[PDB]
Amino acid sequence: FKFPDGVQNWPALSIVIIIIMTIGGNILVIMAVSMEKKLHNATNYFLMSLAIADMLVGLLVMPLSLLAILYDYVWPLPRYLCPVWISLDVLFSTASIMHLCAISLDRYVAIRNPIEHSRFNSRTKAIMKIAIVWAISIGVSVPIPVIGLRDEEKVFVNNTTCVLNDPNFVLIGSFVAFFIPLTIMVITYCLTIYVLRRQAADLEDNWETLNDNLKVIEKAVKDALTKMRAAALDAQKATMKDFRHGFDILQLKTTRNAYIQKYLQAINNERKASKVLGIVFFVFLIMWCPFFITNILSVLCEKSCNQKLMEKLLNVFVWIGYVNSGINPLVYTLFNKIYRRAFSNYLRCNY
Ligand SMILES: Cc1nc2sccn2c(=O)c1CCN1CCC(=C(c2ccc(F)cc2)c2ccc(F)cc2)CC1
């Protein structure tokens, strides 16, 4: 570990900046979800446990990858330390996709069959769901120290570079640890975003007409006045008892701000959450695709392919996937005033 004698790529040390921003960024997420009241809920507990995995990627996987780059991918640490790092790489990377898939799956199940959650509270129900995503993650990574130490060629190429080299494990494992959870996250997300739009459009299309027909009354009628009573007529047929009669009493603009905005902001809130999750989901998908494509493209042709080129591309493609462990705290800041406000305060009033 930085002898320093023997190092062959000193400008690679500049990747430390990537490492520092991946740890500190997710630390702030851990601080925010731990301290902010308006962030204490199942979805944001998922993000904290996710930030714990992404912080441990930058804390335990990124530094030992950088060290290998510094020695031209000739493993500089003891040989037993290679399969330990490979399993820590697999564990925390799987925990990332397993968190995103669990968020999208729980959000989908929360919408289809929203039965009265009478068994446990939301805080404690989240704890079990976080336990299964870590239980699976440990389950995928725990064979690797066995396979690697029992047979060192499964984790060493050319007896020098430390990389996972078991084709059966890499193939089957890529399905269990990446392809299946990614397939679930995409379908559940889109299916969720389809249900949410159909149910919101029920009230929205009635609330949109009443609003538009109010503009013509300020243009500036007996057809536009009855245009607004028919709007609320269909709105009050779907939404608790204070809502049905709430429209039946509706100068008009004051009633809209009095009680309609209670649900109007509620639906917009659900829309803003689907926006953030989709960006987090599909940026994760996009930043891991080049590595996974190039990898699964490297075994579809055993020969007839430039294997030397594949490895060189994968050296860069793995860090495109790694940088994703730092991207999530940035995304929260851009799209949520609670994270952005807490982040600026932790950077100032604490640091
Ligand atoms: C550090 C490094 N450097 C170089 S240079 C040239 C190659 N190369 C490498 O292969 C690696 C290891 C990359 N490492 C990324 C994390 C891994 C996942 C995984 C788990 C188990 C598998 F079976 C299949 C892949 C994963 C990826 C995304 C996820 F969302 C979840 C898991 C394991 C592979």
Sort 294 into a burial class: Cβ within 10 Å, 0-12 / 13-18 / 19+: middle
Ligand 1 neighbours (beta carbon < 6 A): 65, 89-90, 93-94, 96-97, 163, 170, 173-174, 177-178, 288, 311, 314-315, 318
Assess if residue 181 is contained within a domain. Answer: yes
108 Cα–ligand 1 center, Å: 28
**Which ligand 1 atom sits nearest the alpha carbon of residue 73?**
5
Q: Which residues of 113-138 are buried (b: 16+ CB within 10 A; e: fewer)?
A: eeeeeeeeeeeeebeebbeebbebbe
Q: Whose CA is nearest to atom 26 of ligand 1?
A: 93
Amino acid at position 346, single letter:
Y
Domain that holds residue 290: 11-350
Can you give the CATH number for the domain in which 47 is found?
A: 1.20.1070.10
| CA-wise closest residue to 35 among 255, 347, 346, 313 | 346
- Tokens, residue 185: 């996250």
- Tokens, residue 349: 């009033």
Q: What string of H, E and C letters represents the secondary structure of 100-153?
A: HHHHHHHHHHCCCCCCCCCCCCHHHHHHHHHHHHHHHHHHHHCHHHHHHHHCHH
What is the CB-side half-sphere exposure of residue 64 using CA atoms within 13 A?
21
Assess if residue 1 is contained within a domain. Answer: no
**Which ligand 1 atom sits nearest the alpha carbon of residue 181?**
30
Assess if residue 2 is contained within a domain. Answer: no
90 Cα–ligand 1 center, Å: 6
Beta bridge partner(s), residue 161: 157
State the CB neighbour count (10 A cutoff) for residue 332: 24
Which of the listed residues 138, 287, 318, 327 should we mutate to test ligand 1's pocket, taking the one with most ligand atoms within 8 A of CB?
318
Query: Given the DSSP bridges, would you call strands 161-162 and 156-157 parallel, antiparallel or unpaired?
Result: antiparallel
State the CB neighbour count (10 A cutoff) for residue 103: 23
Q: In this structure, what are the phi and psi dihedrals at residue 114, rounded to the nearest 5 degrees?
A: -80, 55
Assess if residue 177 is contained within a domain. Answer: yes
- Tokens, residue 334: 């851009």
Give me the number of domains the chain comprises: 1
Resolution attained, angstroms? 2.7
**CA 28 to each of CA 17, 96, 328, 335: distance values in angstroms, whole numbers, following the listed order:** 17, 17, 11, 15
- Tokens, residue 287: 């930043």
Assess if residue 6 is contained within a domain. Answer: no
What's the distance, Cα to Cα, between the start and end of the chain in Å? 29
111 Cα–ligand 1 center, Å: 33
Assess if residue 316 is contained within a domain. Answer: yes
What is the CB-side half-sphere exposure of residue 113 using CA atoms within 13 A?
3
87 Cα–ligand 1 center, Å: 10
State the CB neighbour count (10 A cutoff) for residue 144: 24
Assess if residue 235 is contained within a domain. Answer: yes
**Vertex 46 angle, CA 323 and 136, to 5°:** 85
Residue pair 297/306 in contact (Cβ under 8 Å)? The answer is: no
